[PDB]
Amino acid sequence: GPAVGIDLGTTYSCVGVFQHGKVEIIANDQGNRTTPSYVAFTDTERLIGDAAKNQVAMNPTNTVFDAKRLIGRRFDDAVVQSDMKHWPFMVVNDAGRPKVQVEYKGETKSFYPEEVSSMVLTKMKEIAEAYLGKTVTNAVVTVPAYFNDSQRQATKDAGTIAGLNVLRIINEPTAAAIAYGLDKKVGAERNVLIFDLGGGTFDVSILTIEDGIFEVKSTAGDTHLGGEDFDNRMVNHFIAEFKRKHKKDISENKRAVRRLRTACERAKRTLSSSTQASIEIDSLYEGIDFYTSITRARFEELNADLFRGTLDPVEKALRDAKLDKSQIHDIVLVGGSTRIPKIQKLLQDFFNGKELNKSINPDEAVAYGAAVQAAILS
Ligand SMILES: Nc1ncnc2c1ncn2[C@@H]1O[C@H](COP(=O)(O)OP(=O)(O)NP(=O)(O)O)[C@@H](O)[C@H]1O
Ligand SMILES: [Ca+2]
């Protein structure tokens, strides 16, 4: 049974497999190459992935996400305390360990963060198995470079309870390098910058590779900056526009807002390829259909300060690593948000026209590298 590579993201997960020298990123039941890290509990079932995310608008208290932010931490953890104040689901304390509390089939139940992740891990496992036509046992799971021993332990545990023989836990930036082959022995030292901007986190890693051996020289970023923040800006923009056109503030209606955001995230993806996209939502508030559009120019304008500030963590990374722009040999893009044109322009201008590594879908790069690593480990 082939060993697979799994990227367990805060917002999206991806699974790949190495077969015949080639790596294949496995698409799910809905045909997506990445599946949301969402779990939802209802009166009749346990929904995982797209099915879960597709119903969050009508089950905010029983649809769990962001488990990667909980995994391996304590309830008393300041991070946990801050974050929990924004999740629409319950987080309880159990002997100092944080636990998610939801209502499943009328009964009230709670789960440890690692149990939630194992649910996502199981979905990936079945996605692979469905594709491969064989049971997947061995696997390599990826984790941010800054995860401590507890967080790594928890990620490993989530895997074992999902029935996966976790061959190894390797850092995400290292996985991204291997995907590009930046680990090949060339008889010299090589500094690589991993620019990872996914759904909810931004990480900048500077790796040094000497004889196939990696050395994370520095890291920086923002655990609270990602594609979701860009969507927010569009939502606020459209709320104002709806109010401007219909004198009706839809902010209070949580269903209206959640449906609008879904339309925005979709428009955003389209903007990375086209110059403008349309927002077509039937009866957003009351019976008023919201039909409008946005241009890429307007979109860039809405997030100008966010995009620009993305360069601060990069400068900090160089500073700490004790390297200048000139010294970094390779720059690889990771995360679905790196598909945004203005962000690609921004990074190149910073690195004075230097070419960016981006032939492998940025949101599949981590999975891609893990798959190769799984293959060699098997
Ligand atoms: N074409 C696109 N243009 C812009 N953003 C995109 C595009 N395709 C996907 N995304 C965004 O990329 C994000 C998904 O990133 P991805 O790297 O798959 O997440 P992840 O691994 O969960 N990362 P993180 O959330 O940081 O742990 C969401 O905010 C998507 O809207
Ligand atoms: Ca990541």
Side-chain angles (χ1 to χ4, degrees), residues 1-209 212 214-246 248-378:
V4 298
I6 309 178
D7 164 32
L8 186 51
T10 313
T11 60
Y12 290 85
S13 296
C14 181
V15 55
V17 65
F18 180 90
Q19 291 207 106
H20 295 124
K22 294 149 277 181
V23 174
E24 305 196 61
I25 294 309
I26 311 161
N28 70 23
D29 354 81
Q30 313 222 324
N32 306 157
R33 290 158 66 89
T34 56
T35 110
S37 300
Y38 275 63
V39 187
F41 302 94
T42 72
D43 289 336
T44 38
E45 55 194 330
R46 177 189 292 104
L47 263 22
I48 306 177
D50 296 310
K53 188 176 179 175
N54 292 330
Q55 58 78 262
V56 69
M58 68 173 102
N59 197 10
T61 55
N62 301 304
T63 303
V64 185
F65 59 81
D66 271 14
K68 193 172 186 172
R69 319 181 86 98
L70 285 312
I71 220 175
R73 317 187 82 111
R74 308 191 75 231
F75 188 83
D76 40 275
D77 202 285
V79 184
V80 177
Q81 282 306 318
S82 300
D83 290 358
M84 70 176 280
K85 307 302 180 290
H86 280 288
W87 294 316
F89 52 79
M90 279 273 284
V91 176
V92 301
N93 184 339
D94 192 305
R97 293 252 266 139
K99 298 199 72 179
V100 186
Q101 193 187 75
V102 290
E103 192 209 309
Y104 176 50
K105 295 177 172 167
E107 267 297 299
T108 296
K109 309 194 177 197
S110 74
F111 300 93
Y112 281 114
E114 45 267 42
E115 302 188 278
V116 185
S117 293
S118 64
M119 274 160 236
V120 181
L121 261 29
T122 296
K123 186 80 195 89
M124 294 311 141
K125 183 188 194 293
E126 63 182 52
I127 281 165
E129 293 188 351
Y131 176 84
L132 298 187
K134 168 57 184 59
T135 36
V136 174
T137 305
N138 308 86
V140 169
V141 181
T142 52
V143 95
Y146 53 85
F147 265 30
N148 58 40
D149 295 314
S150 305
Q151 297 175 283
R152 287 173 204 258
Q153 232 294 105
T155 303
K156 178 197 105 294
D157 287 332
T160 62
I161 85 180
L164 261 353
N165 176 223
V166 180
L167 259 31
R168 191 155 299 148
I169 296 299
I170 67 177
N171 297 330
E172 294 165 358
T174 292
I178 295 173
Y180 279 114
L182 300 180
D183 61 312
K184 273 73 185 308
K185 296 191 255 68
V186 295
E189 225 173 84
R190 149 145 61 193
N191 304 129
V192 181
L193 183 142
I194 315 291
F195 190 87
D196 195 357
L197 184 65
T201 61
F202 179 37
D203 295 332
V204 180
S205 310
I206 290 187
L207 304 172
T208 297
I209 311 157
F214 288 79
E215 177 203 338
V216 190
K217 278 201 187 301
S218 186
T219 55
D222 188 342
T223 57
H224 290 270
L225 192 247
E228 299 192 269
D229 302 81
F230 304 152
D231 304 335
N232 292 332
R233 295 283 183 102
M234 296 178 74
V235 172
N236 293 17
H237 163 74
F238 286 122
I239 282 176
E241 190 187 279
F242 195 87
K243 194 183 191 301
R244 221 212 70 228
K245 241 172 285 174
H246 301 109
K248 272 142 200 48
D249 175 275
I250 68 168
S251 308
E252 33 68 82
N253 182 339
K254 296 153 198 58
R255 175 188 170 67
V257 175
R258 251 175 167 86
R259 290 214 300 151
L260 189 61
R261 187 193 300 293
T262 293
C264 286
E265 196 275 347
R266 198 188 204 303
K268 174 191 69 179
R269 299 197 193 216
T270 299
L271 257 25
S272 289
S273 173
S274 300
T275 41
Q276 78 163 294
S278 52
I279 303 289
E280 192 248 63
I281 305 171
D282 290 309
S283 44
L284 183 66
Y285 197 57
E286 300 171 5
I288 304 178
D289 308 303
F290 196 33
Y291 288 18
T292 190
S293 55
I294 8 72
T295 61
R296 179 187 297 186
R298 175 82 254 195
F299 170 75
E300 293 173 342
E301 179 155 293
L302 295 180
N303 301 94
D305 59 306
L306 261 30
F307 294 166
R308 191 172 300 116
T310 220
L311 300 177
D312 280 314
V314 175
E315 180 181 320
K316 184 64 173 69
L318 270 338
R319 190 183 308 162
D320 296 341
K322 297 295 165 293
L323 302 180
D324 175 50
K325 296 188 185 180
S326 57
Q327 297 175 277
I328 78 155
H329 308 125
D330 292 282
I331 306 176
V332 336
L333 295 179
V334 182
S337 299
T338 59
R339 281 190 173 103
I340 301 174
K342 193 76 176 193
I343 286 185
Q344 299 197 13
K345 183 189 185 296
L346 227 38
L347 232 194
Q348 273 187 147
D349 292 4
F350 183 75
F351 280 101
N352 311 128
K354 196 180 193 311
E355 46 174 354
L356 274 21
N357 284 275
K358 48 171 178 173
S359 46
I360 296 170
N361 280 317
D363 50 353
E364 301 171 12
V366 183
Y368 192 119
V372 182
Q373 187 67 188
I376 91 160
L377 256 40
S378 306

